[PDB]
Design a protein around this ligand. Structure first.
Ligand SMILES: O=Nc1ccccc1
Length: 162
């Protein structure tokens, strides 16, 4: 297991524009296109992201290219965030993957409401952090995924992903 395999399980792979769990147009491996309800706006974003007229459909290679960019950008964002960087750097490699996963799903903004969870993670109070992380809109809206990510933070193992 690694961050790509982990997010691939959590996000799936779809080659046509679909709506994510929040109703937002998305494609590939969880690549958010837009929060606009206008499908034409989503198609424009897609074409801009891929560099050709896609008419709402991409290839597996194209999906994987967006995914590589999106994972890179998520990690680099954490490093550029004054609240997230010290916590991230304090973690082991497996728990770092849980942090990347949460930022990929929620955006660095959301993760940076999580002040108390972040402090507990930096303190390596793993069971306490895990309890706090579940007291969230995140967990209530996507509980099966949140449970896997939380187990990863709690244990520093890949048990929730096999
Ligand atoms: O709350 N988990 C996180 C820790 C460090 C960076 C991003 C998220």
């Amino acid at each position: 297991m690694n961050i790509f395999e982990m997010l691939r399980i959590d996000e799936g792979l779809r080659l046509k524009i679909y709506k994510d769990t929040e109703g937002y147009y998305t494609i590939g491996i969880g690549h958010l296109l837009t929060k606009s309800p206008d499908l034409n706006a989503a198609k424009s974003e897609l074409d801009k992201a891929i560099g050709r007229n896609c008419n709402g459909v991409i290839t597996k290679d194209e999906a994987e290219k967006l995914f590589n960019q999106d994972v890179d950008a998520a990690v680099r964002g954490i490093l550029r965030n004054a609240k997230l960087k010290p916590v991230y750097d304090s973690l082991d490699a497996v728990r770092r993957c849980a942090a990347i996963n949460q930022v990929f799903q929620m955006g660095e903004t959301g993760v940076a409401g999580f002040t108390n969870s972040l402090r507990m993670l930096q303190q390596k109070r793993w069971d306490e952090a895990a309890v706090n992380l579940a007291k969230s809109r995140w967990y209530n809206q996507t509980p099966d995924r949140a449970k896997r990510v939380i187990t990863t933070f709690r244990t520093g193992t890949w048990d929730a992903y096999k």
